[PDB]
Ligand binder design. Structure first.
Ligand SMILES: *[C@@H]1O[C@H](CO)[C@@H](O)[C@H](O)[C@H]1NC(C)=O
Ligand SMILES: *[C@@H]1O[C@H](CO)[C@@H](O)[C@H](O)[C@H]1NC(C)=O
Lengths: 126, 121
């Protein structure tokens, strides 16, 4: 690592990331607009430590995450257009991913769910 | 691990603290020995943000925290011997504090509970 630095207020630090969690349900598009306005993205995990933390901290509520696909015949990608590494199953035939009770599932864009944002920890510098 | 981290691996950063959570239940003494061996202490909260994080991440399980008293007639103190600020009530007549379903309660030293550690940074 480069250094240790606290995530900003209302954000939670796990590994080299800072997570944010809403307590308000809205649609995937509104959620991604919000995340981008925080200089962040809909939540992305790159390690088991990070996925396990999201899956525990969410409690009993569904949370939107940053995986989506243009159709059921297109590849899953992150909101930055990085392709998904297909390391976990995703349930369903819909375009927008969320964490449920069991793991990752898919929903229509206009479903109302709480959301999480992530960003790499910048060490307060960017 | 590249770039910045709030905390070391297996710890979670909230404000100016790093928290650790066991998935193994033990008695309060065993828990505090463990936390000191990590250059840490049984979990201490100094803000609402920190307490709300402990109260959510614990889920449906009881967790030891760093409040303790010598008897039901003595003041609550942190494991560093710094007095409690009495900003939240604690239930019961026992000497050792834990987070339960509802808030903060007290138990005997030999009760088995998962524990949390905290440290500054
Ligand atoms: C998503 O939510 C926002 C805010 O309520 C609303 O403006 C927008 O029309 C919604 N979009 C969809 C596709 O439901
Ligand atoms: C606490 O747990 C440790 C480890 O199991 C054990 O050595 C010790 O006797 C226990 N103490 C009490 C008071 O139960």
């Amino acid at each position: 690592i480069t250094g240790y630095a606290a995530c900003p207020r209302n954000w939670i630090g796990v590994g080299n990331k800072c997570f944010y969690f809403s307590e308000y349900a809205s649609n995937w598009t509104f959620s991604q607009t919000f995340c981008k306005a925080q200089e962040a993205e809909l939540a992305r995990f790159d390690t088991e430590e990070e996925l396990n933390f999201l899956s525990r901290y969410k409690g009993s509520f569904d949370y939107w995450i940053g995986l989506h696909r243009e159709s059921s015949e297109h590849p899953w990608k992150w909101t930055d257009n990085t392709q998904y590494n297909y390391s976990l199953s995703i349930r369903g035939v819909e375009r927008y991913a969320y964490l449920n009770d069991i793991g990752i599932s898919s929903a229509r864009v206009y479903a109302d769910k709480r959301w999480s944002c992530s960003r790499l920890n910048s060490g307060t510098h960017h």
